[PDB]
Amino acid sequence: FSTIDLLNELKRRYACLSKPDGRYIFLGAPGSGKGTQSLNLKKSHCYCHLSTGDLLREAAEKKTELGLKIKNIINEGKLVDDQMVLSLVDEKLKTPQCKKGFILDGYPRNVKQAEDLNKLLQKNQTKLDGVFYFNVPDEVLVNRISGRLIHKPSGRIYHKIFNPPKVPFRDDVTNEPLIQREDDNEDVLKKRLTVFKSETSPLISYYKNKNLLINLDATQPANDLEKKISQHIDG
Ligand SMILES: Nc1ncnc2c1ncn2[C@@H]1O[C@H](COP(=O)(O)OP(=O)(O)O)[C@@H](O)[C@H]1O
Ligand SMILES: Nc1ncnc2c1ncn2[C@@H]1O[C@H](COP(=O)(O)O)[C@@H](O)[C@H]1O
Ligand SMILES: [Mg+2]
Ligand SMILES: [Mg+2]
């Protein structure tokens, strides 16, 4: 590790340290690009990526009664109990990775969860900076889910077409195998999009009333959408 390489690390470090702190919510149906954009901000703004889906799939891996309960709810495309998710969010929000800021990706998924989050932020003396809505049509989301591949250890997201890996079905960093999410099966994605429309769509109006909603056109390329999000934050 050279002096030039050492000084260049500092340049990179001082670029994200100089970025504003932020506490945002990414709202949008599965395949909208929430996880993609959360990984971008984690790199550019050092914001914590709080994914309830990731935390619950992790909880679903445990060979306990609670584990089977979560695994079966997840695989059916339905929502886990509000009290359970709240405890996971309350715990991750305490971690030191959330001091610069965070991205809530997958939470809140209903009006009740939005109220719990509100009470939790009030009691913890922390405030949301915005709620980004990933506006993308249903037809687009179908293809987005179909081609999705993830590297389970890192949570890096790929798409067979829109974001392909260097070598098929292998991670770009570790060259380790990729996986298809069990909930990305055609029939359960249909149930997931239904749950979104019924339980999560009223949050658009809820956060618009709270004057926190920021509309995004999530159908644009990922690198273009990244700049648009960064523009709302740093601008
Ligand atoms: N702007 C985009 N345009 C085209 N494909 C995208 C875009 N953003 C993400 N993708 C791909 O489509 C799928 C969306 O994944 P993801 O970001 O995890 O959505 P979500 O987190 O909302 O479920 C992934 O396979 C990803 O590689
Ligand atoms: N906020 C939440 N409330 C309840 N269940 C959730 C929540 N987030 C994720 N889950 C469960 O885990 C899945 C993960 O979805 P995703 O957010 O797309 O990773 C969902 O389909 C639900 O089964
Ligand atoms: Mg599957
Ligand atoms: Mg702005």
Side-chain angles (χ1 to χ4, degrees), residues 2-3 5 7-8 10 13-17 19-26 28-42 44-56 58-61 67 72-73 77 79-82 84-90 92-93 95-98 101-108 110-111 113-118 120-121 124-126 128-138 140-151 153-165 168-175 177-181 183-184 188 192 194-196 199-200 202-204 206-209 211-235:
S2 37
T3 169
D5 266 16
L7 291 152
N8 280 313
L10 291 169
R13 283 185 186 181
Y14 290 125
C16 51
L17 252 61
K19 290 267 177 219
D21 289 7
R23 297 164 199 84
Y24 300 87
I25 301 180
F26 280 359
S32 282
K34 301 186 299 305
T36 296
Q37 299 309 328
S38 291
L39 294 187
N40 288 340
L41 281 173
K42 188 167 181 263
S44 55
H45 289 69
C46 289
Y47 287 174
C48 176
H49 178 213
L50 205 160
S51 166
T52 52
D54 284 348
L55 292 157
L56 283 157
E58 168 186 76
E61 287 194 5
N72 287 306
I73 276 177
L79 303 175
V80 145
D81 143 80
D82 299 327
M84 184 198 293
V85 232
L86 185 52
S87 68
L88 294 166
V89 178
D90 188 23
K92 190 138 190 164
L93 288 182
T95 72
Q97 285 77 24
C98 299
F102 56 78
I103 306 123
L104 284 160
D105 166 26
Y107 191 83
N110 54 52
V111 196
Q113 283 181 39
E115 273 304 309
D116 296 340
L117 176 66
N118 204 86
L120 190 69
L121 295 176
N124 191 31
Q125 293 156 288
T126 169
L128 280 175
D129 293 292
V131 176
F132 286 104
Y133 182 71
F134 287 63
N135 222 300
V136 29
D138 301 280
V140 188
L141 298 160
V142 181
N143 294 1
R144 288 278 189 92
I145 297 292
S146 77
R148 204 220 315 267
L149 294 176
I150 63 115
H151 173 247
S154 66
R156 276 183 280 273
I157 305 138
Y158 293 100
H159 197 279
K160 288 194 218 167
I161 310 140
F162 314 128
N163 189 35
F169 304 92
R170 293 294 188 264
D171 187 60
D172 279 355
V173 174
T174 75
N175 208 257
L178 301 188
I179 67 117
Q180 199 226 8
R181 281 222 244 123
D183 51 81
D184 284 345
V188 292
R192 281 154 68 90
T194 301
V195 169
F196 181 80
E199 283 254 86
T200 324
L203 287 171
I204 68 176
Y206 176 95
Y207 286 111
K208 194 186 98 190
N209 283 336
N211 299 290
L212 277 162
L213 195 85
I214 153 79
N215 248 301
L216 301 163
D217 172 40
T219 61
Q220 78 189 282
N223 290 341
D224 288 344
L225 193 55
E226 182 189 355
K227 299 168 184 133
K228 204 171 123 178
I229 292 171
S230 246
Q231 192 171 98
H232 283 102
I233 294 153
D234 317 321

